[PDB]
Amino acid sequence: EGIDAVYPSLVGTADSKAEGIKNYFKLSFTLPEEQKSRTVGSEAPLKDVAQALSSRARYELFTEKETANPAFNGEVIKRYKELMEHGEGIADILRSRLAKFLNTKDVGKRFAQGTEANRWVGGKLLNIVEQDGDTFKYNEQLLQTAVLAGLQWRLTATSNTAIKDAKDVAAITGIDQALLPEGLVEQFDTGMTLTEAVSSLAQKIESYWGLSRNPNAPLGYTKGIPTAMAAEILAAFVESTDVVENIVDMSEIDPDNKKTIGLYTITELDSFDPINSFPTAIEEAVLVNPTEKMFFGDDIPPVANTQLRNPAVRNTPEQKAALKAEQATEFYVHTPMVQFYETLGKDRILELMGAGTLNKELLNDNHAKSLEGKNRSVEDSYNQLFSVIEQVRAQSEDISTVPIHYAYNMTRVGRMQMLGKYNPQSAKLVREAILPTKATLDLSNQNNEDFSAFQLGLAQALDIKVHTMTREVMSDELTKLLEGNLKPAIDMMVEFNTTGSLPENAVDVLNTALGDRKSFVALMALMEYSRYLVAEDKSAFVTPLYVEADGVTNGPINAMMLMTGGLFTPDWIRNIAKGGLFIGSPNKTMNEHRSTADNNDLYQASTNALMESLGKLRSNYASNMPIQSQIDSLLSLMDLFLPDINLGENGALELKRGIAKNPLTITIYGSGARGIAGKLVSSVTDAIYERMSDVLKARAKDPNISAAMAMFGKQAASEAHAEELLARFLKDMETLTSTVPVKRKGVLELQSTGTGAKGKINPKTYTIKGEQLKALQENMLHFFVEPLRNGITQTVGESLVYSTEQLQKATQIQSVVLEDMFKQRVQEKLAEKAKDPTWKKGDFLTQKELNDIQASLNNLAPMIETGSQTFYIAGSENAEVANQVLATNLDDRMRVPMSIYAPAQAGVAGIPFMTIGTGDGMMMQTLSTMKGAPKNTLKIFDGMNIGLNDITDASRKANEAVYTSWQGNPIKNVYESYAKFMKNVDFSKLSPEALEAIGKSALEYDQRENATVDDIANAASLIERNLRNIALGVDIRHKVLDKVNLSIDQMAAVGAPYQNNGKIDLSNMTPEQQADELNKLFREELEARKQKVAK
DNA sequence: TCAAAAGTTGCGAAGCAAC
């Protein structure tokens, strides 16, 4: 009588083994102990809620609160009266759609005679209907509560959607990642797919119903009934033009595939709509514990219990203390920046910091697609920021004294991420209007220690490398700028402060003054400096300007220290000092290192190594004229359209550090050679398309110009020079796209593809795609990426790349077994339910049964524990296991497959998990919970913003967190889990397909052709012993380094290093002598451990 | 390379065939 008394008129009995029609709504949901929604028990939820939104007094009575939100004023109330009236029209559409369903093919007649039409995939919505004479009808309470959830979804769905990159789009369309056409990635980010639109809508409907799931009920009904309602509601929104549905077929570009995907977009509201100032009135009136809201003053967000997108993993007690600390920080609004934005306007913001207005006639088709993509990001963040200001402004008269709190969560890689899409952590436009930092400096004298802190904030914002020069040098360079190029822009800003108006040529003045330093933080620097000039009391200046303590190549430096074994080498000592680890130099900062000792970083060192490898490759084929010409053509082509590569008149090749930035970062994350080659070619093609646009522009100005001058005029001294460069571009393009190199027996041969690029170029429709793109990627892969990888390996060392190889092999093998066992166990269960008279194929399993299968995998160690973090590499949500439809709508459309939480193959994802989680992920967690942790800071990944009053103390603490995180042992954590897996595994019970996959990671090509199960088992145990040796070597290295004096300056902005107070002096020694001293301590530690085992 | 997942529709009432 718990749920059978609330809904007594629903069709069918509530017995799982009855004879007639059974009601699976009452067999799957139970009333909660304490109420969660205020719509349970009402008769007309659409009228009860609409009554509560008609006044301020009624809203407080319904919600049982002393005072409502101050933003709930008269204008918002009127806008909410039209929304409810619009919601009554959506309900009428749903009621009429059902009656049509029951009238076709006599579905209603058959269902009344005993046919179980409520168990079909397309008829699961018959479990919430009631009899009415000779026909059926909806249940008013359940239907109207679903419409209320639909109206709230229509207002906030867009701002909560996720971000899909090129990798995600490839998985949807099925095309290869490296050959994704132009504009396809950004097209899929405008709208939402069917799976993500229905799933997000279904979650809202279930929450508003306020019931609990039954653990012993099938997953096809506890998840299908809410989903069948979501598809019907979305169909009604399309009919009402509130949602636009678009169908895109992939056969127009790739004839091979036949996929046809549909995209949905929500019609947006006006930027001046009063409803944007308080868009969550419905949610807070229905849910006892709302989720979508904004927190002011003493409202502190709650702490989450499970990892983001990972319900099986719980946040450790140490990780929960970090979330609590970061959610207590108060954010404030900077009024002068907000007034500058609205006076400038949205159109002028796009012109300045975006692409401005676009003339599609005078642009290339591929160029114009990219330009439109960059305009959307700036416009979306502008609209989001100013909708927040409207809500903040109603709280009090002074907008700058209203505290703001934000909610965080733990990502699956161990990072702390803000919730939302456009927040201070993610959007750079919003970063300069909402700050947690503040200061009160004394700037009456220019020689004060407070003025030097003020200059450091301005210099860094204006793109000056403040961590490579001393304080006196930085001050000199800033003064040259403030009285040179930047003077006209500062003068305009001074007049704006006193008057409040801007000139008509504001964009021209800022573009001319800033130039290549243009950014959002560069505008704040001009605003703060011009505010200081006009101030009358300079001894108490209050500013929110900040200084960021960025990490110098945080990625590669972390990996080189956490995953290197064996003895010390003089090259490791030299290269590790470029990241900020100094041995034998007390109180040494990075400003002193770069100024006197070495002015190169890891990016510059790798480029120097690449040049050495390139010369070796060139001389290797000194007698191969066809090969030599192919290498020359590739380098000539990249010279024209890339600023980092230049060709001398004598053939000398000079490279800059720009080309080694992206490849070095992604090589650490385990990216293959094919990924780097695809990215490098993409940069070259983008520059080519931009050049074709200039041809169109020059032709319009003068239609009698020559082709060579219209394209290379800006880079040619005379007409003859332009003609020469045009010939090079034509010849190089046809050479690379005709013949490609193929590697076999270890040497390279030239093979003709027969698809050379010939014809006349059209500037409007010029495009490189298909077999022409693949030829370009083959030349770059075998002539530029292979030498590049050799150079990177030399700088980071061969010992580091050996640790990453074993790490990837162990995780891939373990994940393969976990996935195969999971599938093998759900098939045995489904074969037992086949003998159940009351079970129908399609209900799948229950939640209790799914937990039992997962709980049987605990002896294979699916999770890696470091003592303060937990990682689950193999977890995913795939629809392959279920392999059936969950629910459709009444029109036999919008079919949604069933997805469950099941393990999947890892691949190369093992390397990023350990490098990021135990690296900057662990360091930031330490920083928040350590003793005397800094306050009022914004902690971006591998960075931190600090107020001007405590730059010195907070920087020292930041270096101490880095030192603490450098004592971790990621290889030891993997070894402990892999040792337990090899103790309880049984290789003889694996499927033949799984055995082949294991052999691809544990055996060589010539040995895995006809391997047995004993060969695979034996080869897998050798990896276990390889991981044991690496972990022992890393452990000894950290103990030896703790005995000597060190200085840590990884965050190099300010110049405050941390000391490890060792008691062994390694000063006045060369790097060769220091390596000998450390190797002596390595052997003393090793011998002591071995004697302990013997004794 | 890490931070989620991925086609649509007739016929008949599940799952293959057509595009």
Swiss-Prot record:
ATP binds at K428, L429, V430, R431, D550, G551, V552, T553, N554, G555, K661, N662. It is found in: Virion. It comes from the Viruses. Residues 1072-1095 form a coiled coil. Mg(2+) binds at D550, D942. DNA-dependent RNA polymerase, which is injected into the host upon infection and transcribes the phage early genes from promoters that have a 5-bp stem-3 nt loop hairpin structure. Belongs to the phage and mitochondrial RNA polymerase family. Contains three functional domains; the central domain possesses the transcriptional activity. This is Virion DNA-directed RNA polymerase. It comes from Enterobacteria phage N4. The lineage of its organism: Viruses, Duplodnaviria, Heunggongvirae, Uroviricota, Caudoviricetes. The gene is 50. The chain holds residues 1007 to 2101 of 3500 of the full protein.
